[PDB]
Design a protein around this ligand. Structure first.
Ligand SMILES: *[C@@H]1O[C@H](CO)[C@@H](O)[C@H](O)[C@H]1NC(C)=O
Ligand SMILES: *[C@@H]1O[C@H](CO)[C@@H](O)[C@H](O)[C@H]1NC(C)=O
Ligand SMILES: *[C@@H]1O[C@H](CO)[C@@H](O)[C@H](O)[C@H]1NC(C)=O
Ligand SMILES: *[C@@H]1O[C@H](CO)[C@@H](O)[C@H](O)[C@H]1NC(C)=O
Ligand SMILES: [Ca+2]
Ligand SMILES: [Ca+2]
Lengths: 319, 172, 172, 319, 321, 172
């Protein structure tokens, strides 16, 4: 009777099903997942000079809404916007709102520069409103001045203010135009005369007429609509106005680059991440992900797949 | 399988073998034994490790937001973004499905090939002193003690020492 | 080919064989025969079916229009759409060319492997009772009647029954 | 010695495929992966569809004669045609393509009465030769041409306000008539300077009917330019005008979602499809297609390839 | 004592490292590069009827800035724009600037057509400026006329001018609106009256009001001329209703056929051939990939974030020791 | 590798062999020789040529500029273009890495297969007149002069001529 040497391979009781080119139900000894389904409901900010704006909307940091008082300047590599964040204390909107917001959320910080603008004795610079409360008392946007006549009814002095960019980089200047509720309110603050507001630089040029009935937003039918433009180095911007201008005390300068995150999820400075979405962070080493098609940073690619199992062993052939 | 060993002429795997992927079972006068082959087990594991190193990765490309979570976007550019993102996602979904399917096919066939290469190494070692069972076993036509069996596993078995005995037993 | 059988040591295919992909032709005293192998034919067909199930499919993603057929679009956004669509089309054209090229290579080599695996199954069955022709045939060194030939195809051929007769004929 | 041979099938007429290594590889069988065949018909079998024929989607909001059968309805598929009519009286719509696109994503239109009424000094039922209906002169069904009843007389400074009583946003459209000559203007609205103010909570805009010579479209040098905006639930829109306004009788509400198709191809309610293009339907099970890069629905991907043959059998080695 | 035949494969002393699915450091006998790292710092224009605009900005060719005088008409299959190229002698901008520039840079040439526009005795057609110098003397955009009152202060005659497209292909008409510095300058040139400028075709329609307001000097001029444009289809008319402040076209433009637009600082070379271009020059490679720039034009290898990708062209190298 | 010949049972390559990829070394009474196999060398080279023809190509798709080099672009459309281009570049980078990795694996294994197919062709030619060395050599059990060796290389060696001599030497 002859002696015998047999060759063979391992097997396991509980094998795993994977897909191949030829077979949809192929049993192998071991497999691992390639698609991440798990998220952390937190913003992992370890190793990041981050800024959580909380209640403050990015546009609010340029015009200086009360809510943004702690966010008027700084440097960051990460900026976090939140839901229902406040940009406007006094009712109004910003022309090209979303372009401006997007521009701030790519930035790596904000510097402020004094405009230097001064006004004659016949102008009241420190005009205030009940809407923009600060220190428990009536106030206004920190980076702008509400220019009104000092003697009620009196025509507003035809004034000219010019900002020059002395810097080596472009500056972001913002101003407001007050559109009053009624012809009564307009004549009361700026006078009976026809109102015109001209803004001119080398590159930008535009005219604004305060249009005078609309529903109440926070019990006020008045509107302050905001405009903005870049002012190139060595260039001037001039404000010709006979009343109705909300003039800048300071212009803004966006510095370097930063990752903008829109999320409701809380911060955590213990955990590290390079990928973020509405719902939080994604720390996975896996190449794919089925959490959201809206992510930011260095991310696994979104796929329309629950699971994709990659075989890490041979065919499982049990006894 | 491509190489015809695993789920092939080798009828099934060994749940009992837990110290390797590939190995031997012998029966002689002395009794029964089992031992794992290191070289061929490590060959298969190292190739799979290589795949995991290549596949378990993301790009280091920094992507910014082009869709606001909390505000409405212009309707025309929104439709372009929606079309583009859905197109990109269709590509990555396809690429992911194909990558894993293709690698899974290769991993299985690669493992099959390592089994066959070991079988063929042994076949050639035993030369004219053994015959193929057909089930991945070799009927040895001479007294092969536990020291002789060890020599087959360790690739030191010298066919010339047992040749004359074996050929006589084979021709009978 | 990778496995060296089809367009290899087997000189050509059989137009006469119309009941299977792989099979046998024998000649003995009693005359000639031909029969298809089911197991190996179905193995090849099932793997190709698998590919067709994976490849003959579209995504279930709903795409809307971003180009008007009947009106002009802004020239700048039109150029972005044109650039994006042409880029996507270059990717899908490439992916399609590579998919089919890669699968075609695999299908051919897979079919080659199934032929070789059958040849090797028979080789091992016949043990010392036959010798390789070189052209994919086995010269059997004993009277193998139509019942014996059937036993080779059905994987029930017992080499030990014909061994003594065969070894005498082989050594002559 | 007896002999057993192993072999594989072959065929007389084999098919050429491309591999990684070989451009001309003969196999026993192959199948196409790229669709070259189209059906020159719109396959609408499972679909609550609407063929607008002669009617342009914007026309269904303002009620051009051609669109009279298309002022309301529900659908899951909307089919626009070439040279479809939107304007009986010459003019255009500001943001035309945004509005068209918005309608073609919709799954239906509901109409809501504005309720607007006008004093004895205003003629609501102004008509034109261009907008023929029942064989007699008419106008846009969803708008009223407001003119003075005594020709030459100044137009009464009037105010009309629509409130959105509904739970979903409404699409309000109005027109501004820009007459050919200063003769025509004074004749219909009077000598005084004309202004038209439109104001909501969100939207606000002013319109001045400009008067100037222009080419004749359907033998008419006059223009009615159309404007539009969304009105949120519970919000009001107010129309301050002293003449030159084309006022809405009804506002529109776009309901749910639907697939917009632009095609010249005829309908067929016997045949089913999920993929459409200018030239018709694509019913193919194949993964790729070389008919058009412009398709809509669930589609095979466009490829720059006549044919891509996928091998379905072994190498063909004949004798 | 027994005869012996051995089978083997070649090897080489110095093998090359490639990446496989399983192995990052696999030594093979031979390999070739698939990613191009080399660029030519030149624009390879052999076999191309090209046009180097040099100092001239494409928009300048339509309105006729001095710098563009040698580029007002022509045919090409390739158009090369340069850095800091001049479009505007007199300060101003073009609404949809980038759409118009892109439209010119897809074109294969420009034809010019006379508008024929005539003006009454009370209008001065040949208004000139110090900014737009030509023949060493004050001038203006060659394809436009600066319409001003001949008697200073006088209200500008309400005029109407209409261009008809007699051609079988669409024409590109451009006009300007002059926005003066001060209310003094405006009344001086066009008169005290409220100013309106209407432009109307079958398809296009728009109104323009010259806004007046203080602004910085660009080339010592606080005034602005902002340019507008539209296509006029065959057999269709465009009409200009204006009471002053219009910069009216003497000629319209026609873009002919197709051409490849290149923005580059690199010099020309009519000895070398290419179908791929970028800021830095030409890419002549037969290789499928390239890591020079993601911004290319023409028939190009695809950009990849990879220094090198070596494709094995031989077996595993197993050397003798 | 997959086929177990190159970096397998054949211990190393021949730096000496400079007139082909695959070939033979023999030792007989007459002395030593070396010769290249044309058929198998050209088979491997032709398959690699095929790959280069498929891979060394760009698309003939004409792309226009959508980013101005010399002027600023609208910030929103610029961000969409930046997102799209970076996404496309991630896809092409991935596709390029996978293509070359996959082809490199195939080229190596293909070359392995051509070596094995030659070995198996020779094995079958020599039939019962030789035995496998285990190191890719065949011990021939009869006088094989330079003319006999040439007959093995040229695929004209007739096993029946030397069979009776060889079987006697093998059994002893
Ligand atoms: C499969 O691989 C992983 C190693 O990453 C391990 O978690 C697991 O225990 C392995 N084997 C089995 C049989 O589960
Ligand atoms: C884009 O996609 C999301 C989800 O499908 C949808 O909510 C959104 O309205 C889409 N945007 C537009 C403009 O259609
Ligand atoms: C986009 O491509 C189509 C044809 O593919 C062409 O007719 C059209 O003019 C292109 N659009 C632009 C803006 O160049
Ligand atoms: C787009 O990317 C390039 C990368 O250098 C950058 O210079 C440019 O400013 C980017 N544009 C925006 C809007 O971020
Ligand atoms: Ca949509
Ligand atoms: Ca184009």
């Amino acid at each position: 009777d002859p002696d015998k040497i047999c060759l063979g391979h391992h097997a396991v009781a509980n094998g795993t099903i994977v897909k191949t080119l030829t077979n949809e139900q192929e049993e192998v000894t071991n497999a691992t997942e390639t698609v991440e389904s798990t998220s952390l409901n937190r913003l992992c900010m370890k190793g990041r000079n981050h800024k959580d704006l909380g209640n403050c909307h990015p546009i609010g940091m340029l015009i200086g809404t009360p809510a943004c008082d702690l966010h008027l300047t700084g440097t960051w590599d990460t900026l976090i916007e939140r839901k229902n964040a406040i940009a406007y204390c006094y009712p109004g909107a910003t022309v090209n709102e979303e372009a401006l917001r997007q521009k701030i959320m790519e930035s790596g910080g904000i510097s402020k520069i004094n405009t230097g603008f001064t006004y004659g004795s016949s102008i009241n610079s420190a005009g205030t409103t009940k809407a923009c409360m600060r220190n428990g008392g009536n106030s206004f946007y920190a980076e702008l001045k509400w220019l009104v006549s000092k003697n009620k009814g009196q025509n507003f002095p035809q004034t000219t203010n010019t900002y020059r960019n002395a810097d080596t980089a472009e500056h972001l200047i913002m101003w407001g135009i007050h559109h009053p509720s009624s012809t009564q309110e307009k004549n009361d603050l700026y006078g009976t005369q026809s109102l015109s507001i001209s803004v001119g630089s080398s590159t930008y040029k535009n005219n604004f007429v305060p249009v005078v009935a609309r529903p109440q937003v926070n019990g006020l039918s008045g509107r302050i609509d905001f405009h903005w433009t870049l002012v190139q180095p060595g260039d001037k911007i001039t404000f010709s106005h006979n009343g109705g201008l909300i003039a800048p005390s300071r212009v803004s300068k966006l510095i370097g680059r930063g990752l903008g995150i829109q999320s409701e999820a809380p911060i955590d400075n213990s955990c590290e991440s390079k990928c973020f979405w509405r719902g939080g962070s994604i720390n996975t080493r896996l190449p794919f992900q089925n959490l959201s098609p809206r992510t930011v940073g260095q991310c696994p690619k979104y796929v329309n797949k629950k699971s994709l199992m990659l075989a890490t062993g041979m065919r499982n052939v049990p006894e | 399988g491509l190489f015809g060993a695993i789920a092939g002429f080798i009828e099934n795997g060994w749940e009992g073998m837990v110290d390797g992927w590939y190995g031997f079972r012998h029966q002689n006068a002395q009794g029964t034994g089992q031992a794992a082959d290191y070289k061929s087990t490590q060959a298969a594991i190292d190739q799979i490790t290589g795949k995991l190193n290549r596949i378990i990765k993301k790009t280091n490309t920094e992507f910014e937001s082009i869709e606001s979570e909390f505000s409405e976007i212009d309707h025309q550019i929104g439709n372009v973004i929606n079309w583009t993102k859905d197109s990109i996602t269709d590509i990555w979904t396809y690429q992911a499905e194909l990558l894993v399917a293709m690698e899974n096919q290769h991993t299985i066939d690669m493992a099959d090939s390592e089994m066959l290469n070991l079988y063929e190494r042994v076949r050639k070692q035993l030369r004219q002193n053994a015959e193929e069972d057909g089930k991945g076993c070799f009927e040895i036509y001479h007294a092969c003690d536990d020291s002789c069996m060890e020599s087959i596993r360790n690739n030191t078995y010298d066919h010339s020492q047992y040749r004359e005995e074996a050929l006589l037993n084979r021709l009978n």
